[PDB]
């Protein structure tokens, strides 16, 4: 069984910083490429960033382009994003998510495999 | 880790050790030694002219522009970059080598011709 | 859908053949580079690699090279051409064992001096056997080789000495070594790896029993081209040493005479002493426990519930029919016949005669013929016998064989294989420019 | 479609063969055959030499950023690609080469300090 | 201005004559001149290859992205390019070399990785 866990944060302030991190297990880690997909509590998916799985190339929707950072660790099975400024519109569920790219020797992907529960956030 | 230390690996492992094997290219009694010398010298340079030819000079891995005819080989990407090492790799696709290297020369030829007419 | 990348670096080789090169630390050239010591040796983890002795190329070049070396090293040495007169020769006076008899002869004959116009009476003790007589009954002799080619005096400076030599690859190729230690000279090896440069080799040369090369490393490995063809030499590796000591009991006190304008010959002056057969011991016991080794092993390729039987060799001249070495520069033939004299069916020595020759052809070649300098005193020598050559006739029976150069060669190249490495190649991936 | 076939052949088409000629420049008694394989490997590095001190390294066809002084060859192009083999072109620029080739090193020298000095 | 002209000019100015030595790097009795001359091509192989595995095929000035420890030498650049000359830097230096060579190679090898995931 694959499972994606979010321990990121809560409610913050606007213009402050917030911190999320996702563990996994039940696969390699250092085999997939991963995303944070956003959910606000009335509304559908939006894609937010994507990181390689070696963590070199790093990929962001222009909205968050110039205040986020997507990282990784493959020795700690660790996906986390650091999200800067916080906005008020930036209030929502955080999915950890495994897929949206490959490696070029590897079959492509452009779909989402695995999903973690959702971190929720708050921008007051 | 060393020369040839991923002759038994798979492919998508082996891809990873290319500097390893490209530096162990290079370096009457006493004549033999440099007719060796000379000709270990001239293989070199004729892979360094191909790469040239087909526009990979300067890197060790190189993207083209020829698409891969099913006819040559038709495994999936994860049997060849995943299973097969490179020594079983280059003895199924043996025949169909030279085809290869042509198709690589005639794109190359097309794209230079092309770039010159969009610098004009 | 998928395209085509290029690659280089690839670790694929193919099968090849290349020059190899000597490292060492006179069998020199002082043109072998030094060993470049500590060679590094990467295990190849899971390659499995075709071997196949007897076809291995490393065998010829080690052949050439030691052949064209020792031509090299006589260019510069006296040739004995004032020695092609009729020798006088009569009986030795000294105390002769029966052993002895008939093998030495006290030789005069007149000498070229350092003057185009002066002649110098000298006299020397030759072995019979480099002489041939030309009267019936008289007591004219001459030189074996007066009628072939000029003999050469080899330089009494140069030693004969078997100093290793390692052959490393050159750039763009490599040597693989196969480690399975019950490998048997052919087929698939599984565990392959790569070499820089092989081990030293020690320039060995003998005949029917292989000294000082490498033992096996847990039992004793028969390895031929084709076991039932009856017409291929069998080399057996041993896993143990059989020791063996040579001698040659005789104080021999050496001569020289100038024969021209810095030409100097020598020759066995005299002898201090009694006059003794030279001989080597083989210990009797480690003897039988090693042919019962062989044996077994041999019935694993015959009948099983059979005979094998062993004996001397047929035929053929001195050269083949005994075990020919350098034993501390002297030139030994040793009779084996006691040895190879029993039947296997389903604190005691064993001693060996040994002939001695000044003159000696070392190659099997007509056109040349190698005057060995007399060694000053009395000579001992002790090697390890690790291998043996035989050749095959109910019942099985083997005889020392191993007149071919190249099979000495073979016992230690075996392991080795020279491939080339080709480093551009192609595969299919989701890249496009 | 050989080596040397299009010799005869206009500017404007012997451009297309480049390739079949670039393949055919690599490959006591026996020196003098040592000596020539070395030096045919010193001449070829020198072409490859002076191809990167000017920014071609790599390609067949290069352009630069020198241009053509009309005293060296006021022909137009339909004379130089329409009516002229490589063989009477050069003996034609034969006596300006030098200049052109110093020219030419010297737009790269200039044109590689500008391009460090534009990635700070 | 002719060969090693500039070795006793500070490095900011010395690297103004690039391709003044790189142009002099090329061009039994006669064995050692031979043996000289294919020695001579091999060096200069080496280090064309060595540029080739840095990712600096073809150029004379080459921007990486390995970082300056301060370790190897922490002079700041009115120090190292306006007075000391490039014997001088090249003693201070010297056994720090095979650890920049290192660097060097392994961010190339990660810059081919990153630029083949991302041309898919
Ligand atoms: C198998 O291996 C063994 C072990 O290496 C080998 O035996 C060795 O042979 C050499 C050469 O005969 C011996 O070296 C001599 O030792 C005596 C010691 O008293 C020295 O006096 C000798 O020097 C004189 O002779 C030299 C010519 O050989 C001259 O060059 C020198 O100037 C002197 O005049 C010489 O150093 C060595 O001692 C033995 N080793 C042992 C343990 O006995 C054997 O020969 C090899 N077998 C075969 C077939 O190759
Ligand atoms: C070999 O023959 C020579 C003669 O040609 C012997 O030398 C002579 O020996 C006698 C003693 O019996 C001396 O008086 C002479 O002066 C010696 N002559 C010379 C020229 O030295 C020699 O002893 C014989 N050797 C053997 C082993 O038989
Ligand atoms: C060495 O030379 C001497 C002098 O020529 C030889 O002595 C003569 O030999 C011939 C036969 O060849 C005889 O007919 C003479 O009577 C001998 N004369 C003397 C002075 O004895 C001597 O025989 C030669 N030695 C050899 C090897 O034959
Ligand atoms: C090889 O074996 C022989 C025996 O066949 C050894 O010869 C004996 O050596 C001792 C030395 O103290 C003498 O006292 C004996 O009289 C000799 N025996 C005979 C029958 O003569 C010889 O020493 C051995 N060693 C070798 C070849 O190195
Ligand atoms: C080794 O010595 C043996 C003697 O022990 C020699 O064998 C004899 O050879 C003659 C001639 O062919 C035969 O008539 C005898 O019957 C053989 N004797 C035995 C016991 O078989 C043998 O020839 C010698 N070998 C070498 C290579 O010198
Ligand atoms: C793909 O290949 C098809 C078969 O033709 C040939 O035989 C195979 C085994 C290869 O050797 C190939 O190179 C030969 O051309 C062609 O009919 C087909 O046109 C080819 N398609 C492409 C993409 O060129
Ligand atoms: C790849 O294909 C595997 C089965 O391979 C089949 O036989 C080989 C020789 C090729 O012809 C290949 O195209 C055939 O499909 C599957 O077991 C494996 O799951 C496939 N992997 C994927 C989907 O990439
Ligand atoms: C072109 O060059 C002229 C200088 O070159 C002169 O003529 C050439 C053919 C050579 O013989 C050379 O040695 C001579 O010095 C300059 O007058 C002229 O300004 C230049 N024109 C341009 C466009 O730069
Ligand atoms: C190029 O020039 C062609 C020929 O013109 C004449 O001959 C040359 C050698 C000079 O002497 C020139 O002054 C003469 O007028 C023309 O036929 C051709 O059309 C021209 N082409 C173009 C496109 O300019
Ligand atoms: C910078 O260098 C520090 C000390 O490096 C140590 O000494 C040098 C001479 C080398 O031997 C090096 O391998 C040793 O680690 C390091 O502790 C430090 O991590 C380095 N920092 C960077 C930027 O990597
Ligand atoms: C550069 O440095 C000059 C003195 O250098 C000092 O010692 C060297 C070894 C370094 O540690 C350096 O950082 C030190 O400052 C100064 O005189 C000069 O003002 C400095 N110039 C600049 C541009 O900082
Ligand atoms: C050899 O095969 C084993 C699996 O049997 C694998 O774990 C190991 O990594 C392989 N060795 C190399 C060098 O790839
Ligand atoms: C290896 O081969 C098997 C069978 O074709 C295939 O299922 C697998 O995907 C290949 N490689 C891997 C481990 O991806
Ligand atoms: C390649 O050609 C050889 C000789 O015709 C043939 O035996 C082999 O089966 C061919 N291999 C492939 C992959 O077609
Ligand atoms: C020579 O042999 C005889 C026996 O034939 C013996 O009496 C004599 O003592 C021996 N000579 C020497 C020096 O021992
Ligand atoms: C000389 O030796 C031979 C053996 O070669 C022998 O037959 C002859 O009888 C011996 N003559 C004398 C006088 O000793
Ligand atoms: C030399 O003479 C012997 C006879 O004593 C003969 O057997 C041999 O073949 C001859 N050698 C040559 C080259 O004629
Ligand atoms: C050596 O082993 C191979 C294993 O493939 C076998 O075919 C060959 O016959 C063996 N050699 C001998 C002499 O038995
Ligand atoms: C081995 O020798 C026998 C002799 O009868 C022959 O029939 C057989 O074909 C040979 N085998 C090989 C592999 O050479
Ligand atoms: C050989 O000599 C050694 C001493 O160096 C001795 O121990 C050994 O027993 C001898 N071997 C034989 C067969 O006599
Ligand atoms: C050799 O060993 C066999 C088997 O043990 C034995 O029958 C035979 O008598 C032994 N021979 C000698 C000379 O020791
Ligand atoms: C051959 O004999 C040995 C020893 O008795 C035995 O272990 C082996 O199984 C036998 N092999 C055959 C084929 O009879
Ligand atoms: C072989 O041994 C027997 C004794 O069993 C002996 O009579 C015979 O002469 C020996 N043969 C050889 C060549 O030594
Ligand atoms: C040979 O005899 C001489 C007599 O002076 C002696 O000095 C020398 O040591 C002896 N050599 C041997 C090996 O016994
Ligand atoms: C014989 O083999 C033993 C193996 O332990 C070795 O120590 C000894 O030096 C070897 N003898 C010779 C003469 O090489
Ligand atoms: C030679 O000129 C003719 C026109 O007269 C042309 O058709 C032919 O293709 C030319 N040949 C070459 C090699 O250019
Ligand atoms: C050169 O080509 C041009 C354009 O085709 C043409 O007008 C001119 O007459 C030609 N001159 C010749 C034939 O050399
Ligand atoms: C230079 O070359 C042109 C064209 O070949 C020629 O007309 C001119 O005479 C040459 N000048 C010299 C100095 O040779
Ligand atoms: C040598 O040093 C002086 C200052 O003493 C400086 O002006 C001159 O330019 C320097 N020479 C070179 C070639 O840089
Ligand atoms: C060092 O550089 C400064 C600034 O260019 C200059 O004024 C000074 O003369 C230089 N000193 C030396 C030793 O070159
Ligand atoms: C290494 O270089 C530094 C700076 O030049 C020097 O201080 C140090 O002593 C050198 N170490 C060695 C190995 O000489």
């Known amino acids: 069984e694959v499972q994606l866990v979010e321990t990121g944060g809560g409610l913050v302030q606007p213009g402050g910083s917030l911190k999320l991190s996702c563990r996994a297990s039940?696969?390699?880690?250092?085999?997939?490429?991963m995303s944070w997909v956003r959910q606000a509590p009335g509304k559908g998916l939006e894609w937010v960033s994507l990181?390689?799985?070696?963590?070199?190339?790093?990929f962001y929707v222009d909205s968050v382009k110039g205040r986020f950072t997507i990282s990784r660790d493959n020795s700690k099975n660790t996906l986390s994003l650091q999200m800067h400024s916080l906005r008020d519109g930036d209030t929502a569920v955080y999915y950890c998510?495994?897929?949206?790219?490959?490696?070029?020797?590897?079959?492509?992907?452009?779909?989402?495999?695995?999903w973690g529960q959702g971190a929720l956030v708050t921008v007051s | 880790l060393g020369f040839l230390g991923a002759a038994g690996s798979t492919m998508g492992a082996a891809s990873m050790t290319l500097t390893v094997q490209a530096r162990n290219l290079l370096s009457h009694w006493g004549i033999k030694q440099l007719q060796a010398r000379v000709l270990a010298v001239e293989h070199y340079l004729r892979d360094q002219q191909l790469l040239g030819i087909w526009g990979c000079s300067g890197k060790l891995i190189c993207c083209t522009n020829v698409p891969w005819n099913s006819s040559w080989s038709n495994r999936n990407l994860s049997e060849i970059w995943d299973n097969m090492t490179w020594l079983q790799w280059d003895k199924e696709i043996s025949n169909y080598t030279q085809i290869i290297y042509g198709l690589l020369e005639e794109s190359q030829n097309q794209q230079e011709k092309n770039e010159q007419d969009l610098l004009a | 859908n998928l395209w085509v990348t290029v690659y280089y670096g690839v670790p694929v080789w193919k099968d090849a053949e290349t020059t190899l090169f000597c490292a060492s630390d006179v069998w020199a050239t002082h043109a072998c580079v030094p060993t470049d010591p500590n060679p590094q040796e990467i295990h190849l983890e899971n390659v499995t690699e075709e071997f196949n002795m007897w076809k291995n190329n490393m065998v010829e070049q080690m052949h050439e090279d030691i052949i064209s070396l020792w031509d090299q090293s006589l260019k510069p040495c006296v040739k004995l051409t004032p020695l092609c007169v009729t020798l006088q020769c009569t009986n030795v006076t000294n105390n002769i064992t029966d052993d002895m008899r008939g093998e030495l002869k006290n030789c005069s004959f007149n000498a070229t001096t350092e003057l185009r116009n002066k002649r110098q009476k000298v006299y020397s003790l030759f072995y019979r056997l480099d002489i041939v007589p030309m009267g019936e009954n008289s007591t004219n002799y001459r030189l074996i080789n007066c009628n072939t080619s000029a003999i050469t005096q080899a330089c009494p400076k140069v030693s004969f000495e078997p100093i290793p030599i390692h052959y490393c690859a050159p750039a763009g190729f490599a040597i693989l070594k196969c480690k399975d230690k019950k490998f048997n000279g052919t087929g698939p090896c599984p565990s392959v790896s790569t070499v820089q440069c092989t081990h030293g080799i020690k320039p060995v040369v003998s005949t029917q029993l292989l000294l000082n090369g490498s033992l096996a490393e847990e039992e004793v490995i028969i390895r031929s081209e084709n076991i039932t063809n009856n017409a291929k030499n069998i080399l057996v590796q041993l896993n143990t040493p059989v020791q063996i000591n040579c001698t040659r009991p005789n104080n021999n006190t050496v001569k020289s005479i100038r024969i021209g304008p810095g030409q100097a010959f020598y020759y066995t002056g005299d002898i201090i002493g009694d006059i003794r057969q030279a001989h080597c011991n083989v210990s009797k016991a480690t003897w039988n426990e090693t042919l019962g080794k062989v044996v077994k092993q041999l019935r694993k390729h015959f009948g099983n519930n059979t005979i094998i039987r062993f004996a001397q060799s047929s035929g053929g001249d001195l050269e083949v029919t005994t075990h020919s070495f350098n034993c501390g520069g002297e030139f030994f033939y040793c009779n084996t016949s006691g040895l190879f004299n029993s039947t296997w069916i389903s604190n005691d020595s064993i001693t060996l005669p040994c002939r001695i020759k000044q003159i000696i052809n070392m190659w099997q070649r007509i056109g040349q013929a190698m005057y060995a300098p007399p060694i000053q005193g009395v000579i001992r020598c002790v090697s390890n016998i690790t291998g043996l050559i035989l050749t095959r006739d109910t019942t099985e029976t083997f005889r020392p064989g191993g007149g071919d150069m190249r099979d000495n060669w073979r016992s230690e190249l075996y392991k080795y294989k020279v491939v080339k490495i080709e480093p551009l190649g192609v595969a299919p991936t989701r890249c496009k420019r | 479609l050989g080596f040397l076939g299009a010799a005869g052949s206009t500017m404007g088409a012997a451009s297309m063969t480049l390739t079949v000629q670039a393949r055919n420049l690599l490959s006591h008694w026996g020196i003098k055959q040592l000596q020539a394989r070395v030096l045919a490997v010193e001449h070829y590095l020198r072409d490859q030499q002076l191809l990167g001190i000017w920014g071609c390294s790599g390609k067949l066809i290069c352009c630069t950023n020198v241009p053509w002084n009309s005293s060296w060859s006021n022909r137009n192009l339909s004379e130089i690609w329409d009516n002229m083999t490589w063989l009477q072109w050069d003996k034609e620029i034969s006596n300006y080469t030098q200049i052109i080739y110093g020219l030419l090193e010297e737009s790269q020298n200039q044109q590689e300090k500008n391009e460090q000095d534009l990635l700070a | 201005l002719g060969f090693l002209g500039a070795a006793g000019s500070t490095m900011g100015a010395a690297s103004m004559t690039l391709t003044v030595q790189a142009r002099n790097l090329l061009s039994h009795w006669g064995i050692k001149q031979l043996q000289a001359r294919v020695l001579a091509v091999e060096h200069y192989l080496r280090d064309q290859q060595l540029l080739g595995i840095w990712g600096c095929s073809g150029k004379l000035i080459c921007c990486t992205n390995v970082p300056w420890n301060s370790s190897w030498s922490n002079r700041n650049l009115s120090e190292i390019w306006d007075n000391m000359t490039w014997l001088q830097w090249d003693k201070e230096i010297s056994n720090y070399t095979q650890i920049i060579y290192g660097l060097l190679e392994e961010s190339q090898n990660q810059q081919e990785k990153n630029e083949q995931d991302l041309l898919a």
């Open positions: 990181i390689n799985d070696r963590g070199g190339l790093t």
């Open positions: 039940g696969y390699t880690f250092s085999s997939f490429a």
């Open positions: 998510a495994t897929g949206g790219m490959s490696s070029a020797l590897q079959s492509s992907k452009y779909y989402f495999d695995f």
